[PDB]
Design a protein around this ligand. Structure first.
Ligand SMILES: [Zn+2]
Ligand SMILES: [Zn+2]
Length: 73
């Protein structure tokens, strides 16, 4: 169908943001990451806030916005 189910989403890693991380700005909301934020890490290594890309993945496409690769096998 080209979107993810909840149970598929839960298979993707969640990362808590920390100061030394390379992640800097979320390319969907265009806000800086902050010390507690929850990031969704796609298997291609592209990352977003959970709150920003989860609706994308479950209502728009199950492919990475940047590299267009499917996020589940
Ligand atoms: Zn965001
Ligand atoms: Zn990607």
């Amino acid at each position: 169908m080209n979107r993810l189910r909840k149970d598929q989403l839960k298979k993707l890693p969640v990362h808590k943001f920390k100061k030394g991380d390379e992640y800097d700005v979320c390319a969907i909301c265009l806000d800086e990451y902050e010390d507690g934020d929850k990031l969704r890490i796609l298997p291609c290594s592209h990352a977003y806030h959970c709150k920003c890309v989860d609706p994308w993945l479950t209502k728009t496409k199950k492919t990475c916005p940047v590299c267009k690769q499917k996020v589940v096998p």
